[PDB]
Design a protein around this ligand. Structure first.
Ligand SMILES: Nc1ncnc2c1ncn2[C@H]1C[C@H](O)[C@@H](COP(=O)(O)OP(=O)(O)OP(=O)(O)O)O1
Length: 308
């Protein structure tokens, strides 16, 4: 009996008994499902190992206030609509700002918003909305907002039960309807289930503010995919979020362009194929915000260096 020859046997046996990736080898680069929703963050896309948030799965995005979570989600919503999709936003926080949303790429006019009254209602109308197999993506702002019917009237019970049940009924559905479900989870609750239901769990934290000059613009966010059942987990990804513009695609190409030698630094003087872009990230960002085919080439070049 041979070791490696006997590991892959059982290993492939466990998958056939529980799932596609119930046992992964962190090293694996394996990729054969595609159908992903770009998050608008290149580093994060590769970080997920499949280019984007899978489709037909529940996804958790947790983190503290002002971390970027909602932005990633809104970003997901855009790329989703852009390629002819329908997005439903079950709001229970009442924090959404259409101005900022549209400025990210979302089609607000055609965005379905619902402001459930009870937490049970939200999960009902959210499931109901999914079962119609028409939605591409659906985001539920605030797991913590989904408060049980009571407590809004006369320790005494549980909410994590409300979540459980809802997920159990809903998991099946969105799975064979190809509708991705983003659950915003702002905190540092009843998610004692979503942790096992989710096939992908994102951990967003605001690494540090972006100097820029006098005052600041946006922040630098770090996302650690602690759970990923489609690809190998524990991957990380950083990216900039300008305040008022959202995630910076441009800023992605650099942080990413240098980690792969496509762009070079001649002493805080970024350059590509001979010609230079500027002196200092913020400056080389602008350079790319003007010439787009130059970026379209670098962007094109990195999607070729890795899974596509
Ligand atoms: N209304 C807005 N106007 C301008 N900039 C905004 C606005 N809302 C958010 N931003 C920018 C700056 C914020 O630091 C950044 C992150 O936004 P947000 O999507 O609010 O992150 P988040 O999901 O961690 O926060 P929250 O837990 O409140 O949902 O987006």
């Amino acid at each position: 009996p041979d070791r490696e020859k006997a590991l892959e046997l059982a290993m492939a046996q466990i998958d056939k008994n529980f799932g596609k990736g119930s046992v992964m080898r962190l090293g694996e680069e394996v990729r054969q499902p595609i159908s992903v929703i770009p998050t608008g963050s290149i580093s994060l896309d590769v970080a997920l190992g499949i280019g984007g948030l899978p489709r037909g799965r529940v996804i958790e995005i947790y983190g503290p206030e002002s971390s970027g979570k909602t932005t990633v989600a809104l970003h997901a919503v855009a790329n989703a609509q852009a390629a002819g999709g329908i997005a439903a936003f079950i709001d229970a926080e009442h924090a959404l700002d259409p101005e900022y949303a549209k400025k990210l790429g979302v089609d607000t006019d055609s965005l379905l918003v619902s402001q459930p009254d009870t937490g049970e209602q939200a999960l009902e109308i959210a499931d109901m909305l999914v079962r119609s197999g028409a939605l591409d993506i659906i985001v539920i702002d605030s797991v913590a907002a989904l408060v049980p019917r009571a407590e809004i009237e006369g320790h005494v019970g549980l909410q994590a039960r409300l979540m459980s049940q809802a997920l159990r009924k809903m998991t099946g559905a969105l799975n064979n309807s190809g509708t991705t479900a983003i659950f915003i989870n702002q905190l540092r609750t009843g998610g004692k289930a979503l942790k096992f239901y989710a096939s992908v769990r994102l951990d967003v934290r605001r690494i540090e503010t972006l100097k820029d000059g006098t005052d600041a613009v946006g922040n630098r966010t770090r996302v650690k995919v602690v759970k990923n059942k489609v690809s190998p987990p524990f991957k990380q990804a950083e990216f900039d979020i300008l305040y008022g513009q959202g995630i910076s695609r441009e800023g992605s190409l650099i942080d990413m362009g240098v980690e792969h030698g496509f762009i070079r630094k001649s002493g805080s003087w970024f350059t590509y194929e001979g010609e230079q872009l500027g002196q200092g990230k913020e400056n080389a960002r602008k350079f790319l915000l003007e010439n787009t085919d130059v970026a379209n080439e670098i962007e094109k070049k990195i999607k070729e260096k890795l899974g596509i």
